[PDB]
Design brief:
- 2 copies of one chain form a homodimer.
- By secondary structure, chain A is mainly beta.
- Chain A has one helix at residues 87-93, and strands at residues 2-3, 10-15, 18-24, 32-33, 43-49, 52-66, 69-77, 84-85, 96-98.
- In chain A, a hairpin with a 2-residue loop joins strand 6 (52-66) and strand 7.
- The longest helix of chain A is centred in the C-terminal third of the chain and has 7 residues, at 87-93.
- The relative contact order of chain A is 0.28.
- Bound molecules: yttrium ion (Y1) (2 copies).
- The PDB classes it as hydrolase.
Chain lengths: 99, 99
């Protein structure tokens, strides 16, 4: 797809087999979802920095599907105001910024 | 240009005649710089919101240039950890996300 940026670029994503909405966010290094359940082991990861650090769970090699593209990426699971697709997942799907 | 997403997509921009580096950030509604001086009329604007809102100065129709594309946009001036080119400016330059 080619996505213009007059609205927030939210997309439907299937992550670890679950359907969610998430924002295509070129300002975010990492991908993060709240309220999904992923199986297997994870590594704790300290993220954020404002007012303290947030502890989240980092999962490796998680299946992700966006617009028919099935890829694998690192996914953090923890509290987030909205779900974020960061540049880690964007590089897997081959997304570029163009003008 | 076509900008891949393996690193943070910083670009050099000229804003109000002053040369700055800033992040192309499809997760940001607005464009914000710290430590530029803009002339002319501004109004305070409350932005952000998690933890409280941040007060910034909003300037209209500011000249912005990126990779030789001269556009006009709203620019907010106030505290920000990195300067940000948000969706308001990216729609003016015709930037899209593509995969
Ligand atoms: Y929540
Ligand atoms: Y952001």
């Amino acid at each position: 797809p080619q996505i213009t940026l007059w609205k927030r670029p939210f997309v439907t994503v299937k992550v670890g087999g679950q359907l969610k909405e998430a924002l295509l966010d070129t300002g975010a290094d990492n991908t993060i979802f709240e309220d999904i359940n992923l199986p297997g082991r994870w590594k704790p990861k300290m993220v954020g920095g404002i007012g303290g650090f947030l502890k989240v769970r980092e999962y490796d090699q998680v299946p992700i599907e966006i617009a028919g593209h099935k890829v694998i990426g690192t996914v953090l699971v923890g509290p987030t105001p909205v779900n974020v697709i960061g540049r880690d997942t964007m590089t897997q799907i081959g997304a570029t910024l163009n003008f």
